[PDB]
Amino acid sequence: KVFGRCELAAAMKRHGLDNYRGYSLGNWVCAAKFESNFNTQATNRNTDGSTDYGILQINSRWWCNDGRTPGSRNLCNIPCSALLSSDITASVNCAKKIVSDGNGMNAWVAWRNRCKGTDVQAWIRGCRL
Numbered sequence: 001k002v003f004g005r006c007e008l009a010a011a012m013k014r015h016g017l018d019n020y021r022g023y024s025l026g027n028w029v030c031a032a033k034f035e036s037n038f039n040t041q042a043t044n045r046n047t048d049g050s051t052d053y054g055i056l057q058i059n060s061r062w063w064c065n066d067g068r069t070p071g072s073r074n075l076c077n078i079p080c081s082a083l084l085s086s087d088i089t090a091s092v093n094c095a096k097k098i099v100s101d102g103n104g105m106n107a108w109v110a111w112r113n114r115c116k117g118t119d120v121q122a123w124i125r126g127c128r129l
């Protein structure tokens with residue numbers, strides 16, 4: 001599923017990501033835009049051999065099991081394929097663990113380099129939330 005911008009905003013709000021650990025909703029929409037272009041099926045291989053999965057590009061080294069990453073910790077206790085669903089519940093649950101791990105949203109490279117320090121409220125402009 002390729003989400004619309006406000007469609008994704010409403011789903012993330014439903015799941016409690018608005019100001020989760022202090023990160024306003026626009027931060028989460030911005031991250032999804034630049035990590036996956038709002039596409040739940042996105043996958044990208046990293047140089048270290050791990051792969052990033054789903055709308056928030058959650059990484060197989062630490063967070064999910066994809067059967068082909070040495071040393072996988074699988075801390076969200078899910079198969080990485082579960083992150084590609086049109087239902088974003090699994091991705092959101094796992095993202096809550098990640099952002100609570102100590103570095104906040106800096107865990108998402110695209111957030112750090114493209115959202116941090118910008119007017120992220122623009123990502124929810126026009127949305128009825």
Ligand SMILES: [Cl-]
Pocket residue numbers: 021103104105
């Ligand atoms: Cl933080």
Ligand code: NA
Pocket residue numbers: 059060061062063064065066071072073074075
């Ligand atoms: Na893992």
